[PDB]
Amino acid sequence: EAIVKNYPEGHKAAAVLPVLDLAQRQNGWLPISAMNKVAEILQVPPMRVYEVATFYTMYNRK
Amino acid sequence: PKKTSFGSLKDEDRIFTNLYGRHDWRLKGAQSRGDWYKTKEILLKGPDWILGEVKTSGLRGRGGAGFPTGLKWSFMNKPSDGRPKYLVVNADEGEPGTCKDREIIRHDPHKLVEGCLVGGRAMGARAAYIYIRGEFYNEASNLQVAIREAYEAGLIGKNACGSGYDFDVFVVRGAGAYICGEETALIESIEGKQGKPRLKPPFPADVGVFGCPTTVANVETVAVSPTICRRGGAWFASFGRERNSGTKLFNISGHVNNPCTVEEEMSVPLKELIEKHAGGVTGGWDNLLAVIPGGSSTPLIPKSVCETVLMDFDALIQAQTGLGTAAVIVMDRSTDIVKAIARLIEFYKHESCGQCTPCREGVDWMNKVMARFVRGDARPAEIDSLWEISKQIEGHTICALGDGAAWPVQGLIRHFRPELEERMQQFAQQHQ
Amino acid sequence: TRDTQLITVDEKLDITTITGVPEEHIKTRKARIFVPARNNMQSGVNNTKKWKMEFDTRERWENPLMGWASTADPLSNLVLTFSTKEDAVAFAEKNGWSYDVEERKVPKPKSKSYGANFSWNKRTRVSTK
Ligand SMILES: Cc1cc2nc3c(=O)[nH]c(=O)nc-3n(C[C@H](O)[C@H](O)[C@H](O)COP(=O)(O)O)c2cc1C
Ligand code: SF4
């Protein structure tokens, strides 16, 4: 909630990187079900979270 | 007067006076060294006065592009429409050889925070987003704490410094990408997408983050602006040659005895910089081979040019290279000069975002060719082929990462061609 | 100007009787006058410059020996190229062919803005690049 309130209303998608990293910090790695969850919370299409997940190297998909 | 010699910056004229973190980095210590002093008076002067001091000082972007900051920050001094305006501080610092912006963040966090407020005030910005690479988790945390102390002290937030100006300072962590250091690729990363640069126009001053007027500025450029306002533009402009003013943070790494970050005057001779601070080239000056004078993105120069080159934007341009981030990398005579540059092209092939064809396909191409020049597994005609390829990439890409993949190659081919042709000779006689 | 002594002819030009064409393929053939549509697989627009005249498709059957496509229409592969719609229509009239004309279709000018992809409050903002 604190993360999402850092961005203008109407631009929740800007929280994809921090919230996706928060999933990795809680779990250690990003399973497909973690990215699917971040898509639900921020209401961005899942494919747009898969793009972010595979673009940056600090995310562990294994 | 016009001192024609430069260097020997005195400890009283240094801006980043906590560069080594031997004094307290928190708010209490920072104010004891000058930070957050008379900031209210600076803000009440207004944006026109602030932009006046930045222009007069001749401050130029420390992020590597080296544009006039005063002119760049003036695109934001226009009447607003319905959109908010933002200042984005570029704390990504991914350039190999560069580590100056790391020191500022974890040892002088309050200088950056005051730069954001002063700089944000000049541009009419409602907040500053500080984008710091994800690897710097401890340096970002330090900055986040200093941001808290400023909030609790009334220095930022609602009615910042008591001046009746409302300002916010946000920290956003990256997730691993050298390409997100590019100004537009940073913006797309803040907005939640892949770090892929945008074409220009539009320019960020018109359409930036969230689609609003934005200015992206480096950590070091923002961090020095409050001091330029307190001490005046003329004081800053008193250093370095003309159109090359100010102090500058230098990293000296590679084959030196004492690698170190250090502050020194702009336009100091490169040799004097290495010898006095870094402890000389490993094995003595006569053991020097070539120096990359501004991080990997700039061409390397040989020992002959290194004798009498000055460290400023214009002196290095006429050396066919650039000041860049001013990250001096030294390579001594035992270095495999071909293999050093091959690893740089491998770095770029790993960082290219893949968006646009010349860099997606070209840099990956130059990586394959350089991998063979290291083994000598080629024929001399491929050297000129690689030169032509590097020119097809340069100036044809969306962003400057493509240009910076080519320039390392052009430097090696420009000055060490006999080294390349020599290594091809050995492989041929061995295998034939 | 001219030295040869001209004459006046007010009749509309018709050459059906001297073309040598059989009666069947003049009276019962409908000629189509059109600018060919752009092949949608490619983006080039170089084949949409001229006017074409083509005739109605007729029966093609399978050859009992090898299965090839047999035809009995002498005009199956005939295609004429014209600079203007008026030349094409002029040609068909003097040859006695019934015809249709189809107006050239031209893509309307579009409003393309790169900056729209990053709009502050509009739906044209793109979710990806
Ligand atoms: C591939 C690439 C990486 C870059 N990385 C950085 C960086 O890490 N830090 C930085 O300040 N500028 C970086 N830049 C330059 C920025 O695009 C931009 O010029 C800079 O943020 C402007 O800051 P300044 O005007 O204060 O110098 C990079 C540019 C490119 C093309
Ligand atoms: S030059 Fe390379 S990094 Fe820059 S936009 Fe093109 S592909 Fe991406």
Calpha distance B155→B151 (Å, rounded):
6
Angle, helix B100-107 to helix B109-123, in steps of 10 degrees: 100
Question: B355 CA distance to ligand 2 centroid (A)?
Answer: 6
Task: Work out the angle at residue B263's Cα, subtended by the Cα atoms of residues B261 and B264, and round it to the nearest 5 degrees.
Answer: 130
- CB contact, 8 Å: A52 with chain C? no
Distance from CA of C112 to the nearest CA of B (A): 13
Angstrom distance (rounded) from CA B14 to CA B104: 13
Whether B211 sits inside 8 A of C127 (CB atoms) is no
Is the previous residue joined to B202 through a cis bond, with omega within 30 degrees of 0? Answer: yes
Rounded Cα gap, residues B163 and B40, in angstroms: 6
Residue C62 identity: E
Angle between helices A46-55 and A16-27 (to 10 degrees): 70
Rounded to the nearest 5 percent, the helix, strand and coil shares of chain C are: 15, 20, 65
CA B281 from chain center: how many Å? 23
Residues 6+ apart with CB under 8 A from B83: B211, B212, B213, C120
Q: Which of C118, C126, C128 should we substitute to test contact with A (largest number of A Cβ atoms within 10 Å)?
A: C128
- Chain centre distance of CA B106: 17
CA distances from B375 to B299, B339, B430 (A): 22, 9, 12
Atom 6 of ligand 1, residue of closest alpha carbon: B181
Sheet with B327-332, strands from edge to edge, namely B260-265, B247-254, B327-332, B288-292, B301-302
What residues of C are in the B interface, CB distance below 8 Å?
114-115, 117-121, 125, 127-129
Distance from CA of B211 to the nearest CA of C (A): 4
Nearest-angstrom CA–CA distance, B278 and B188: 38
Going from the C-alpha of C106 to that of each of A11, C39, C42, C89, the distances in angstroms are 39, 14, 16, 20
Neighbours of chain C (3+ CB pairs under 8 A): A, B
Transcribe C25-64 into DSSP letters. HHHS-EEEEEPPPPPTT----TTSSSEEEEE----EEE-T
Which residues neighbour A35 within 8 Å (Cβ) at sequence distance 6 or greater?
Answer: A20, A23, A46, A49, A50, A53
Provide the pairing of β-strand C98-101 with C30-34.
Answer: parallel
Give the ligand at the shortest distance from the Cα of B198.
2
B50: nearest Cα among B1, B121, B102, B106? B121
Residues of chain A positioned with their CB less than 8 A from the CB of B190: 14
**B149 vs B33: CA distance, rounded Å:** 16
Residue C110, min C-alpha distance to chain B (Å): 19
- Of B121, B110, B232, B210, the residue nearest B168 (C-alpha): B121
Q: B410 and B295 in contact (C-beta within 8 Å)?
A: no
User: Rounded to whole angstroms, how far apart are CA atoms C118 and B214?
Assistant: 13
Residues 6+ apart with CB under 8 A from B199: B398, C114
- For chain A, breaks with the C atom over 2.5 A from the next N come after none
Query: What DSSP element (H or E) covers C100?
Result: strand C98-101
Look at chain C and count its residues: 129
- Helix (H) / strand (E) containing C69: strand C69-71
**Torsions phi, psi of A51, nearest 5?**
-60, -45
Interface contact flag, A51 C121, Cβ < 8 Å: no
- Which approach determined this entry? cryo-EM
Ligand 1 site, CB within 6 A: B 61-65, 67, 69, 72, 90, 92-95, 178-179, 181-183, 216-218, 221, 399-401
Q: Which amino acids of B are annotated as binding site, given as ranges?
A: 61-70, 173-221, 353, 356, 359, 399
User: Mind spelling out the 3-state secondary structure of B35-53?
Assistant: CCCCHHHHHHHCHHHHHHH
B411 burial via Cβ count (<10 Å: 0-12, 13-18, 19+): buried
Cα–Cα distance for residue pair B343/B157, rounded to 1 Å? 45
DSSP tag of C82: E
Q: Ligand 2 centre and the CA of B384: distance in Å? A: 24
C-alpha span between B239 and B231 (Å, rounded): 13
Asked whether the beta carbons of residue A13 and residue C128 sit closer than 8 angstroms, the reply is no
Distance CA B331, CA B281 (A): 8
The arrangement of strands across the sheet holding C80-82 comes to C80-82, C51-55, C30-34, C98-101
User: Contact B277/B252 with Cβ under 8 angstroms?
Assistant: yes
Count of CB atoms within 10 A of residue B231's CB?
15
Q: Which residues on neighbouring strands pair with residue C54, listed in sequence order?
A: C32
What tokens were used for B294?
A: 């501004």
Gap between the Cα atoms of A24 and A4, Å rounded: 17
Burial C79-115 (b: 16+ CB within 10 A, else e): ebebeebeebbebbeebbbebebeeeeeeeeeeeeeb
> Which residue in A10, A7, A21 sits closest to A49, CA to CA?
A21
Alpha carbon distances (Å) from B65 to B102, B224, B341, B349, B404: 19, 17, 21, 21, 11
Q: Would the CA dihedral through B172, B177, B183, B184 be positive or negative?
A: negative
Q: Which of C115, C119, C129 comes nearest B193 by C-beta? A: C129
Q: Which residues contact B219 (CB under 8 A, 6 or more apart)?
A: B62, B89, B90, B91, B93, B101, B104, B105, B112
Chain C interface includes B85 (CB < 8 A): no
Dist. CA B417–CA B272, nearest whole Å = 28
Nearest CA to B304 among B277, B286, B329?
B286
Nearest by Cα to B352 from B395, B389, B397, B401: B401
**Cβ contacts of residue B307 below 8 Å, gap of 6+?**
B271
Rounded Cα gap, residues B331 and A18, in angstroms: 39
A13 contacts chain B (CB < 8 A): yes
CB contact under 8 A, B193 and C128: yes
Three-state secondary structure readout of chain B: CCCCCCCCCCHHHCCCCCCCCCCCCCHHHHHHCCCCCCHHHHHHHCHHHHHHHHHHCCCECCCCCCCEHHHHHHHHCCCCCCCCCEEEEEECCCCCCCCHHHHHHHHCHHHHHHHHHHHHHHHCCCEEEEEECCCCHHHHHHHHHHHHHHHHCCCCECCHHHCCCCEEEEEEECCCCHHHHCHHHHHHHHCCCCCCCCCCCCCCCCCCHHHCCEEEEEHHHHHHHHHHHHHCHHHHHCCCCCCCCCEEEEEEEECECCCEEEEEECCEEHHHHHHHHHCCECCCHHHEEEEEECECCCCCEEHHHHCCCEECHHHHHCCCCCCCCCEEEEEECCCCHHHHHHHHHHHHHHHCCCCCHHHHHHHHHHHHHHHHHHHCCCCCHHHHHHHHHHHHHCCCCCCCHHHHHHHHHHHHHHHCHHHHHHHHHHHHHHHC
What's A20's DSSP letter?
H
Q: Are B110 and B150 in contact (CB under 8 A)?
A: yes
The nearest CA of chain B is from the CA of C118 a distance in Å of: 5
Taking a C-beta distance cutoff of 8 angstroms, is the pair B283, B353 a contact? no
Question: What residues of chain B lie within 8 A of the CB of C125, using their CB?
Answer: 211
Q: Give the bridge partners for B128, in sequence order.
A: B87, B169
CB A56 within 8 A of CB A24: no
Cβ count near B16 (within 10 Å): 21
Q: How far apart are CA B59 and CA A42, in angstroms?
A: 41
Q: How far is CA B400 from CA B179, B250, B283, in A?
A: 10, 22, 36
Other CB atoms closer than 10 Å to residue B75's CB: what's the count? 14
Fold of B27-237: Rossmann fold (3.40.50)
User: By the 8 A CB rule, do B179 and B155 touch?
Assistant: no
* C-alpha distance from A34 to closest chain B C-alpha (Å): 16
Which among B135, B37, B133 has a CA at the least distance from the CA of B93? B133
Ligand 1 midpoint to CA B326 (Å):
13
CB atoms within 10 A of CB B130: 25
What are the binding residues of B for [4Fe-4S] cluster? 353, 356, 359, 399
Atom of ligand 1 nearest to the CA of B65: 19
Give B182 Cα–ligand 1 centroid separation in angstroms. Answer: 5
- Preceding-residue numbers of gaps in chain C (C–N over 2.5 Å): none
User: How many interchain CB pairs under 8 A, A with B?
Assistant: 59
Residue list, annotated binding site of B for FMN: 173-221
C-alpha C57/C-alpha C30 separation (Å) is: 10
Answer whether the bond into residue B201 is a cis peptide, omega within 30°.
Answer: yes
